[PDB]
Amino acid sequence: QIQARQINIFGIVQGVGFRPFVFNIAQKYNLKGIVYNNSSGLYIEVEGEEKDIEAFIREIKENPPSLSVIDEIQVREVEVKEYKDFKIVGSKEDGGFVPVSPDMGVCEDCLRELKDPKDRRYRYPFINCTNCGPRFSIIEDIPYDRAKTSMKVFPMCEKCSREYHDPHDRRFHAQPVACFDCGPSLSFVGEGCFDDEIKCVAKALKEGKIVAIKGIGGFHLAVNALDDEAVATLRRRKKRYGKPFAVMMRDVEEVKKYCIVSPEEERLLLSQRRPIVLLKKKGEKLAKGIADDLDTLGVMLPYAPIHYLLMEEIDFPIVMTSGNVSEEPICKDNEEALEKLKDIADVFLLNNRDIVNRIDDSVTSFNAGAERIIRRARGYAPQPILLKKEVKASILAVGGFYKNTFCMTKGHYAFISHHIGDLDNEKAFNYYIEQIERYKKLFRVDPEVVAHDMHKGYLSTQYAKSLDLPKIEVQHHHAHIASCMAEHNLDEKVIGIAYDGTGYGTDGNVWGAEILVCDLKSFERIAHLKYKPLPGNELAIKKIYRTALGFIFDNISFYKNFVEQVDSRELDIILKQIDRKINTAYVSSMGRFFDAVAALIGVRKEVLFEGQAAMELESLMAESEEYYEYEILKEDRYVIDPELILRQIYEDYMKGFEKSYISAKFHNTVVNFTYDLANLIRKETGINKVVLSGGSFQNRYLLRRLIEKLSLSGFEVYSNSKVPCNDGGISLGQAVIANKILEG
Ligand SMILES: [Fe+3]
Ligand SMILES: [Zn+2]
Ligand SMILES: [Zn+2]
């Protein structure tokens, strides 16, 4: 017997080698039929053995082409039609852009040619073809063409030229084609070294030195991830970091030794997008100082020819952290890196190919049955987000402050930028401004309106106000909810749960623990945490014991052991400044709530970076169904007093309960009261769609447990997946809100 199916794939499917893929996996499972493009995405007709079609449907479902963004797959039964063969058939929809693709990791064919001793490009560190290599990182302008890339200064040799022009070659119109004879080459700076440049880097790593490596999107810093001393000297030389290091490993087998790797996680690792994937550790096997006191590790695989070559010369994982002092934009030019990283790196691996657009490594993960991206950069940007509704007019969304991205709309596309970083330094600002001009140029966008955060002290806000265009201001947490709404094409009233550290509220106070009823044009504040004073504002976020004190300010005597640990003079002044309202904001913030908890139970008195106590509190928790009592009090809106929950936490602490146990109980309390609020709002409003966004949802337990709880009570639950739930996704939300305000 023979079985026949008709398959529709909706989403971004062009420009990603999807059709040649379908053709190949057709010859694989020996199937007959056709594939072609349509307006919605792709059309497939397939017939053959029942075991081949279910597997075909699985390969498309489980490992589709890396650069594709599949939104929906539909399968219907159809009558057998007896096809002779399989064909890639054309359509009026053929040649459907996007003009600029993300940078791509080395493809399987280039890998095999890199490792083939008989191949002219054997060991060539800049090998690429039509299906891989640098794209965005070297592109100045459009249409995509060598002359409009940093490859224009290299004249092609004969051998590369005929490959480029041969329509049946895998390097046909491969713009950055190269070989040893005509292409870029590597250089080694530092101490003398006789060998080839990769071997030198291997030697330097082996000796416990820091190597600055020029990759695709910029420079990165590497040491031997098994060498405690080398990791320690990098920690000392950055000195202002604290953040965990990402690590590069040679293959999935090596990852499975250090981390838990599910199939979806393996798909993200092996993807040509090649991101860092945050993974659960399997027992401490790496050096101290990589990712201490945390149960997760960011792992990436090789992505450029240089890494594959490096991997056969070393037998240890390597730290691969951004090439910057502190946290400013990473270096991109040779001379810029040699100066900026002089006190960090011992040696450098350079090359003579300009990086035009610097772009950081992406950082992603898998949780609650979907990809949850933390930092959307190399391999993802500058691919647009697909919108169901055509945008009325072109909007520039300037984003926010932390982990900034900007966003431009045109047609059915939201062109969100790659991760820019914190807009709090000259270097970040230039990078930002510069890249706005580049995106405008690459995607032919001329913005008519500007959307910005309500906060007046953001560089992004100041920039918006400095432009000569109508301005729409957007509340921070509304933009979080909306950013998720854009992903899932929602355009109706939802229950929006916006939990994060901070964002300017419409009442003038800090928000970040809000339940909103909102659509794309407006919102209503329905619920938040009871305001507590944050004495010293910014300082209290580093010294989180101050946040604790702010939360417990009207009930100091209850927390005897904790308050007696604080210097008496400081305590007096902290308590007086709250009374006199000096340098003190009032906050409704999930990030601060967590910080207070962390401080009270001796996890952390002071943090090296924002969110450290939040991440550690999550890592140390035990398995527990238990939780703390809470009262939902109805005032002007629905409010919960965090101090009443802190009371019980401190009690448990004083009785000698484990931090692991208390952390778990706290996590369940937030989940439980949030669920209870969501039910109250649904009961009043009739709204059954819930959106979860804001940085707090980077917490795996929080997101997972809440999606489960709400789904099991009939909620239709949505959270970020294509853009981050952190401030990296804000711009997308700003854009869709601005569009909706214009529309009517
Ligand atoms: Fe935020
Ligand atoms: Zn290739
Ligand atoms: Zn050549």
Side-chain angles (χ1 to χ4, degrees):
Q1 212 201 72
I2 305 285
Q3 206 95 338
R5 301 282 178 267
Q6 171 252 300
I7 310 163
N8 296 346
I9 306 165
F10 296 163
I12 304 161
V13 316
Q14 272 196 72
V16 301
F18 213 130
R19 295 178 296 155
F21 168 76
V22 180
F23 172 94
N24 290 350
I25 49 162
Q27 312 275 47
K28 219 271 274 291
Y29 296 110
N30 206 238
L31 285 155
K32 337 285 195 188
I34 56 88
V35 61
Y36 66 79
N37 294 307
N38 56 28
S39 56
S40 321
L42 218 66
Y43 184 97
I44 289 146
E45 216 170 289
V46 79
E47 49 188 44
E49 296 278 348
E50 197 178 332
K51 74 198 79 57
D52 304 332
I53 66 153
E54 291 177 36
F56 196 85
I57 288 166
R58 263 166 205 143
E59 271 268 284
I60 282 166
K61 273 186 162 189
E62 81 189 14
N63 49 256
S66 304
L67 265 67
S68 76
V69 188
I70 294 172
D71 290 321
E72 191 181 333
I73 304 177
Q74 295 177 357
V75 181
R76 290 86 189 275
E77 301 166 48
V78 291
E79 288 292 275
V80 200
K81 288 185 172 67
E82 296 197 306
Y83 281 94
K84 181 268 188 181
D85 59 50
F86 199 85
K87 284 303 161 77
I88 295 171
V89 305
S91 66
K92 76 180 212 314
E93 297 294 312
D94 273 354
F97 317 113
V98 168
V100 182
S101 93
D103 305 288
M104 285 168 288
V106 200
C107 73
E108 194 85 341
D109 308 303
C110 283
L111 202 60
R112 172 189 39 89
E113 289 177 348
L114 184 65
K115 297 193 179 294
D116 174 15
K118 287 145 216 213
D119 192 283
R120 182 177 68 101
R121 290 188 178 84
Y122 179 50
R123 300 188 54 86
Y124 181 64
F126 305 101
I127 193 175
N128 61 264
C129 70
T130 192
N131 298 326
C132 72
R135 295 295 181 276
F136 173 69
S137 69
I138 63 180
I139 289 165
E140 291 159 29
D141 197 21
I142 59 162
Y144 174 52
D145 180 69
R146 188 176 179 103
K148 310 272 191 188
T149 65
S150 63
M151 280 309 291
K152 59 186 143 178
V153 291
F154 294 84
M156 283 182 283
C157 69
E158 314 278 57
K159 217 104 76 169
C160 288
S161 185
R162 70 146 298 289
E163 284 178 297
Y164 180 93
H165 291 110
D166 177 352
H168 290 344
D169 196 279
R170 208 188 72 260
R171 276 169 269 264
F172 172 62
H173 288 333
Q175 305 300 334
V177 276
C179 68
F180 288 102
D181 307 328
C182 70
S185 50
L186 300 164
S187 315
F188 191 83
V189 176
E191 211 159 353
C193 185
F194 286 68
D195 259 312
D196 85 292
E197 288 79 6
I198 295 298
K199 246 101 160 192
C200 296
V201 178
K203 180 175 260 181
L205 295 169
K206 211 99 75 197
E207 293 171 328
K209 299 199 182 307
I210 300 149
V211 180
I213 300 166
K214 196 184 180 177
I216 301 297
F219 283 79
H220 296 84
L221 293 159
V223 291
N224 171 2
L226 301 181
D227 192 291
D228 300 52
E229 277 173 25
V231 177
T233 61
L234 185 62
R235 282 275 171 208
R236 198 189 318 113
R237 283 179 190 181
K238 294 213 56 170
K239 210 171 188 299
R240 295 201 169 265
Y241 209 50
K243 271 192 173 69
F245 289 137
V247 171
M248 180 181 283
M249 296 179 197
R250 71 212 297 113
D251 55 34
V252 169
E253 209 215 69
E254 188 165 56
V255 191
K256 306 263 184 66
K257 282 178 189 150
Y258 299 87
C259 301
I260 291 166
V261 189
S262 57
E264 297 281 28
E265 283 163 331
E266 194 177 313
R267 167 194 156 266
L268 300 166
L269 285 169
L270 291 163
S271 185
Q272 238 184 306
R273 300 200 187 263
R274 284 334 230 226
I276 295 160
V277 179
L278 300 171
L279 302 162
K280 293 280 166 174
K281 289 185 192 185
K282 262 182 203 168
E284 294 287 5
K285 302 171 186 305
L286 291 182
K288 297 178 178 301
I290 300 298
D292 286 330
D293 307 305
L294 290 161
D295 71 332
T296 52
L297 176 66
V299 182
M300 73 188 324
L301 292 180
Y303 60 93
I306 56 168
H307 303 115
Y308 289 100
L309 297 167
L310 180 58
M311 291 292 154
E312 58 196 54
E313 303 296 322
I314 59 170
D315 50 284
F316 48 80
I318 55 174
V319 171
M320 199 64 74
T321 174
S322 74
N324 52 10
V325 328
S326 198
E327 282 181 285
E328 83 284 323
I330 61 162
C331 292
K332 83 177 185 202
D333 289 300
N334 300 352
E335 61 283 347
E336 176 202 355
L338 293 163
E339 204 77 12
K340 201 86 168 76
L341 308 184
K342 66 188 162 176
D343 311 318
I344 327 265
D346 300 301
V347 290
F348 299 77
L349 181 76
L350 315 164
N351 63 64
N352 54 356
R353 196 176 69 191
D354 288 349
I355 295 163
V356 172
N357 310 300
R358 99 192 65 219
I359 185 162
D360 266 295
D361 292 333
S362 288
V363 176
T364 193
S365 70
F366 200 86
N367 186 40
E371 182 179 7
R372 315 291 175 180
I373 194 154
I374 282 90
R375 177 200 268 167
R376 195 191 140 90
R378 182 180 47 74
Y380 289 80
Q383 187 167 59
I385 305 308
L386 188 64
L387 307 172
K388 186 193 152 200
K389 289 173 302 163
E390 189 194 358
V391 176
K392 192 185 193 288
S394 281
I395 302 154
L396 168 64
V398 296
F401 166 45
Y402 305 99
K403 306 171 152 76
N404 172 100
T405 62
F406 62 80
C407 186
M408 285 158 206
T409 60
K410 213 195 170 184
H412 292 270
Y413 293 108
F415 297 103
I416 184 158
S417 78
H418 50 286
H419 176 81
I420 304 293
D422 297 353
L423 292 176
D424 68 348
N425 54 283
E426 174 182 359
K427 199 167 170 191
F429 197 62
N430 294 150
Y431 185 30
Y432 175 82
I433 301 310
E434 254 190 55
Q435 284 294 306
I436 289 169
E437 298 306 312
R438 182 129 282 144
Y439 276 61
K440 279 197 279 188
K441 206 198 278 188
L442 299 181
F443 306 107
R444 259 54 169 158
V445 179
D446 193 5
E448 292 180 78
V449 303
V450 192
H452 69 83
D453 202 278
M454 224 147 260
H455 194 136
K456 292 168 183 283
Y458 281 13
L459 274 169
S460 62
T461 299
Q462 299 186 48
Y463 170 74
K465 297 194 203 294
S466 77
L467 286 167
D468 195 45
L469 294 174
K471 288 108 187 178
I472 300 171
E473 65 175 13
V474 182
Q475 199 279 315
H476 190 82
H477 301 88
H478 185 201
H480 270 311
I481 305 315
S483 79
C484 178
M485 286 176 72
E487 290 197 35
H488 301 267
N489 298 126
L490 303 173
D491 182 19
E492 51 178 291
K493 292 205 210 286
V494 297
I495 296 166
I497 305 170
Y499 293 173
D500 68 1
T502 175
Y504 181 82
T506 59
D507 66 340
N509 297 314
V510 173
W511 292 8
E514 325 306 311
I515 321 281
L516 316 171
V517 167
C518 56
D519 52 19
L520 294 173
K521 69 191 182 305
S522 67
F523 76 86
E524 189 180 335
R525 200 182 189 195
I526 304 292
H528 61 87
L529 291 172
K530 197 184 180 196
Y531 282 127
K532 305 288 172 177
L534 188 76
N537 286 328
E538 178 46 47
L539 193 85
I541 299 184
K542 227 56 170 287
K543 300 184 172 190
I544 57 157
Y545 71 87
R546 294 178 68 97
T547 306
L549 286 169
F551 271 62
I552 70 159
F553 86 103
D554 55 10
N555 195 223
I556 288 292
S557 57
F558 189 89
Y559 301 84
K560 194 188 164 82
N561 177 48
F562 175 82
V563 305
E564 285 179 347
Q565 274 198 89
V566 170
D567 166 270
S568 314
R569 188 58 81 189
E570 191 183 358
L571 180 64
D572 187 57
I573 286 148
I574 287 176
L575 286 183
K576 282 177 189 277
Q577 79 171 302
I578 293 165
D579 191 71
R580 276 96 191 214
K581 296 162 186 160
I582 309 170
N583 194 39
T584 299
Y586 293 80
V587 308
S588 162
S589 165
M590 193 55 63
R592 297 298 73 72
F593 197 177
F594 278 78
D595 286 348
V597 175
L600 280 177
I601 66 167
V603 176
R604 216 93 206 152
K605 219 138 172 286
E606 194 190 305
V607 298
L608 298 166
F609 58 95
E610 150 69 338
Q612 186 182 356
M615 296 159 61
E616 293 185 350
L617 218 41
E618 184 195 2
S619 283
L620 61 83
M621 66 176 289
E623 293 265 344
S624 184
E625 290 297 326
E626 283 157 314
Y627 71 102
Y628 296 110
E629 303 173 82
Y630 50 82
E631 310 169 50
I632 299 162
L633 215 70
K634 187 58 195 284
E635 298 179 34
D636 281 326
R637 31 190 75 88
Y638 290 107
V639 53
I640 291 163
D641 191 343
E643 197 275 331
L644 296 181
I645 292 162
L646 294 177
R647 275 183 212 188
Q648 300 159 73
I649 284 158
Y650 181 85
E651 268 184 78
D652 274 9
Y653 185 65
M654 279 313 297
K655 300 214 285 304
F657 280 96
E658 295 272 310
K659 300 186 217 308
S660 61
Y661 173 78
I662 291 159
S663 175
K665 273 179 83 175
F666 181 60
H667 280 89
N668 295 329
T669 308
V670 184
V671 175
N672 289 3
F673 74 57
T674 307
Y675 168 92
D676 277 339
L677 285 168
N679 274 270
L680 281 161
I681 297 141
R682 171 169 82 180
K683 195 189 186 299
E684 285 185 354
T685 63
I687 298 164
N688 202 49
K689 301 194 199 285
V690 185
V691 171
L692 316 175
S693 202
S696 294
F697 290 115
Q698 282 166 286
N699 182 300
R700 300 166 107 110
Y701 191 87
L702 236 46
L703 186 75
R704 190 179 59 71
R705 292 299 242 95
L706 205 40
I707 293 184
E708 280 181 34
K709 253 219 161 194
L710 297 157
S711 312
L712 288 160
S713 303
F715 285 95
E716 306 154 73
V717 187
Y718 300 87
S719 188
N720 291 282
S721 174
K722 286 171 192 177
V723 300
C725 67
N726 63 44
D727 293 4
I730 282 296
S731 65
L732 174 60
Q734 290 173 341
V736 292
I737 291 161
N739 183 67
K740 193 76 182 194
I741 290 175
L742 288 197
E743 195 180 289

